[PDB]
Amino acid sequence: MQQYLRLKAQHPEILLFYRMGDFYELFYDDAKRASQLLDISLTPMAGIPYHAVENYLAKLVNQGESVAICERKVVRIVTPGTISDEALLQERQDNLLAAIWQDSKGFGYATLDISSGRFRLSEPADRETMAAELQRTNPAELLYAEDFAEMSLIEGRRGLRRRPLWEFEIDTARQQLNLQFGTRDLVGFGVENAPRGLCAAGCLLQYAKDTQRTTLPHIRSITMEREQDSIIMDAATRRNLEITQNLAGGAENTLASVLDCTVTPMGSRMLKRWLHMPVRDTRVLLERQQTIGALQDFTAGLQPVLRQVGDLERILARLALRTARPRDLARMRHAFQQLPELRAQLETVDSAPVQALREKMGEFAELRDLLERAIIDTPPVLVRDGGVIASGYNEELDEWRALALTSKGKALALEKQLYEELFDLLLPHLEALQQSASALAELDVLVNLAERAYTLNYTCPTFIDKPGIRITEGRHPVVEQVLNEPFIANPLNLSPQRRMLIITGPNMGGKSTYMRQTALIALMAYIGSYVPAQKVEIGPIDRIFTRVGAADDLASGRSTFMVEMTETANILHNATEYSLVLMDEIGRGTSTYDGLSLAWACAENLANKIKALTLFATHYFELTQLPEKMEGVANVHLDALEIAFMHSVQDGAASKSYGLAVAALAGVPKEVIKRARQKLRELES
Amino acid sequence: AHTPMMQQYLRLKAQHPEILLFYRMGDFYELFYDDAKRASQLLDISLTKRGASPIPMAGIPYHAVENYLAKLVNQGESVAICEQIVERKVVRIVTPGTISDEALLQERQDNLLAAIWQDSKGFGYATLDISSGRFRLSEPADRETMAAELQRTNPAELLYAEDFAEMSLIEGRRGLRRRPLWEFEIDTARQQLNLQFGTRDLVGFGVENAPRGLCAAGCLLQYAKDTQRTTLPHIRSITMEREQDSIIMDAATRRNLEITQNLAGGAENTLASVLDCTVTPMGSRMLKRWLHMPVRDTRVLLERQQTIGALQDFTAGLQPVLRQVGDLERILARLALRTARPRDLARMRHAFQQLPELRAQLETVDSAPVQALREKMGEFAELRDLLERAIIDTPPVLVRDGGVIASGYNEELDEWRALADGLTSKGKALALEKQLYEELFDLLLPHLEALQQSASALAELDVLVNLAERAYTLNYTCPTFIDKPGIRITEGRHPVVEQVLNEPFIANPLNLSPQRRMLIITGPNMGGKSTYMRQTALIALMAYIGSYVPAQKVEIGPIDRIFTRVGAADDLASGRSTFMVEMTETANILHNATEYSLVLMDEIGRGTSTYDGLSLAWACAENLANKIKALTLFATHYFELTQLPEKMEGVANVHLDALIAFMHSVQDGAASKSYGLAVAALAGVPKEVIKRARQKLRELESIS
Ligand SMILES: Nc1ncnc2c1ncn2[C@@H]1O[C@H](COP(=O)(O)OP(=O)(O)OP(=O)(O)O)[C@@H](O)[C@H]1O
């Protein structure tokens, strides 16, 4: 098997499936590794059946192992982060391939999603910023330089690939990006000025082309992300707020669950991206609020029609690579048929953004006519053994079928030839189809947000020039849905005159909920959707900081005081007058004298020098003295009556938080409580 | 009104009112009317319409049916599949609780179908595994006990009474099915179980005495029988479970110890990750079950400890041969239900070939338990012989069109295959092949009782060989048992932290006795106090599973229950603040504690005003030592608590120390300072902030 060895030499570290007869067979060391990973029988030869190759590949991709498929040439390389096929891919989640580079100046980062074609680059300078980017992106595959100095960040990620220095060279990168984009200058894209990002991008493009083994028609643009453009949240802040996953790792009880009712899969993925990155620019937000208001009345008619369209973004990418299935094309014909009705309903409503969206969608009538002649309504799964081309598209194919094994073979050859030509006719308009899919996806997200607003009484928010937040009748999006009992509503007022509020309250009195609600409303205003309150006035916000969830991590090697203290440090170092900080009790883990001393100091610094908008929850009642000392801090108290909880914020400072009464509600035995009351009376005495 | 074919669909739908029906027409499975609309939303499929007396139609192809079924099962939706015999009958119902097919199932996880029945006397519960054949019964009288049992079992599908009072426990669970009261009947249940297990009385099983359990079990067996649509040969026994037999762990305790999943829901950094590297899938699941339930009886543990010692030398030879056997338990269940694919029969031939070599290595080793495991496994040479003649080494995936039968298993099939090689002959060859495949199922069925026993032994051997290899690599030692409850540990190391820490791990000894039941542990922050308390619990659970333990020598007294109160969390859904979640856990310990139990408590009184927290802790400690009299480890940062041992009998103070550089050594005495500000500086708090904090602490102490 010298031929296997020579091909293996080309790809030494990647498992190779060699197609012999009807099976793909690994050999030698690869067979041993495969038998352990896929539980196959190690006869050294290990075999995978041709029909179920996708199922096995899915297991290897989850593991992170690259596979090379050989039909002799290697047609393609399948890797985590570079997969276009439906079975490996996830309906409501996306795969990102990333490259990281380190220079003396700083870090360079690039991310490409193969199916959407979205290419983004950035240059994080601090070590901390790179970590936050790595977490939000969650790249499936990371390509890194051999000399990377800090390998602490890269080791956790799955599918790491080590890269040689020559690939990251800047001069080759500028030339390569220019050829694919087709622009002599990257100045129009805006990526020409920053060298480190371009180096990472050149490597990513080179690797992607190598794995795909074909031209990439879909990628036509590159973009740069900057800190001024979006609100910044550290990974700890993101997890505590539970935007897409709860603290225990589950889908339910999340802001996404309340707001995601989208009919199409592409809408769902897009909503999550919008939720993760709040957009600071007021102009895009104003257009979004207006489109939502216009379509609120017509939402019911549009939701059934949109569902039929389905996800087209993925289908277009498969068409670009010429791997599209017969079923994929048929789903597209159905989507085109839905486009005329959508346009008619959209024409009646009159608003400038909505009309533009209607124009972007298009009708593509000529293409639909071609598909209706070209494809049968029920399509056989395999083109290789299928009657996918319908009768009447081609006179010759019909003649061969009527003549009907030479006739069958000729017909089969003709059918495949016609199928390939079909890709060619559809290719000239591929940019137009790609533009439409983006427009339809935006519509689904916007219609869904409108329906939710009507059902749950949401209200549009108003932006202001100075940074401040004012709310009337505020209701938490998640807790209100969960509690059967009526959710009491709490107002909020924050201004440069009153930046900080110290919330002191009885246990189980609603203090944590009030703080989580304020942050969640601000994230919603900046995604441009409606806010659950009677009136919202919101200023500019650069960053959101949350210190609400307490845990100690063994993998981190950190105790609970340590995890809490690390988070306080990030806030003190990176806070800005624009950012909003909400924090829970400080020094809970350690002894009382130390905890009070540390908390008084952190609060004084945040009010006096950082000047950020802040909400502070304290069980230490000495801290209520601090608002008197410093301007810009005020006291607000949640209230409860004995025990029954009012759940309503009032001005003033709470005293005598009750723990023993809460313990009785918990079920602690009465005799234990009786001794405790006696002990407490002694301690106070 | 409707067309005649449409009428036939309507009649079948009438039989099954609330479950989606896949009607197979031509090469596609089609759903109609309301079913089509629901399927299109759930399976993301098109909703075309065909016109007859405006019919909604949704279609899925035959090849992708398996992929589609998986999506519905994970969702929790039952599907009924109908194939035309002309008349059509529902061949099977696929439901979340019972799955026999490989794709829907997970290799290292198992599916439990459960029934809960409620009566004034007490709750009744039963659980059935469709693949293992394991049937278990229970009667947990307390509401708390039922909830903990439900969490450990985690049933995929739960069947409940229409009038069940405690709907909340049922709420929050996937797959709930409401059931009519007539099915949960005691007199009928006794008759049904007796027919299935072949016993006139249930006394031998020991389930005859329990009335509530019998009713729940009767509903489960009947439901399983209908969904499958065939006799279930594999279930052969029902076993009562009792509180005395196994150590009892509350649901919060299992999460804090992180035996199989971490606080954030991930496999990494768990005791199972450190202790599990088992070659076979069946072994991995068995170890997880053993880890969840620790066996109180000393005699079973002693047989296990001996086996681990005997095979430590021979583990390297045994590990490769075991991997080749792989999973046979699941393959056996499919053979019993007659749903097995041609590949599964070929996989079986491979495992039988591995049994002879394994026996030779085992024979030389001379230990009484080891010899017993070897005899149970058997060789099964005859089964291997017929399988080898029957199947080609490479087997085509589909029986319907296949060369799966090898030449010579049947002379007649060979004659047809040759004639076809030389449609009518090909069809006859295919028809004969299907008949032969069914006959092969019949030949293997009589030996099913033996094969099931063999599979259990191989799974047991694999857990044991893996435990022995791990013991040599990480230097584990066997523990010893004493009649009076007590804990004696020398040079103990936490299993998980030591593996993940690059630096060397300091080792700490421990002594707990009836004379000194409660130890109060006080130390500086980042000083190792929490790791030590977790270390004691993990060694105890490992001793009771019979594995070697990570310490130089361990002496252990009997323990009825383990209580863990560590970690801080709040549940927005259950509407409890952190202080309440902690207090609910403390209340469970005070109410259910016994002298034999072990209590580990971490920082009780956090999350509330200091005076209140201290008072609650003083009372909880005093009550536990004076009345409950259980072994207690109490981590704390309140230094008033250290004065208590002088006041009461059985209480001692032990302190971890650090000079900040952390020594990490446990020594007798009480530690005065927690050193919080210095730990903050290590974290990265800005120096100016630390300097202000130091000034404040000095001011507070000076005033006092
Ligand atoms: N015996 C030991 N040898 C080496 N390292 C140890 C030892 N004990 C603990 N450590 C390390 O020290 C760290 C202390 O963790 P742990 O959470 O137990 O401290 P702690 O006392 O709980 O701190 P805090 O009270 O501030 O939460 C752990 O991450 C562990 O890795």
Ligand SMILES: Nc1ncnc2c1ncn2[C@@H]1O[C@H](COP(=O)(O)OP(=O)(O)O)[C@@H](O)[C@H]1O
């Ligand atoms: N405004 C409110 N109206 C109704 N229920 C509320 C309100 N605020 C909080 N709750 C409920 O009270 C519980 C306790 O509030 P929480 O803030 O968690 O306690 P704590 O203030 O001690 O942190 C929450 O789980 C929530 O379900």
Ligand SMILES: [Mg+2]
């Ligand atoms: Mg809270």
Ligand SMILES: [Mg+2]
């Ligand atoms: Mg701790």
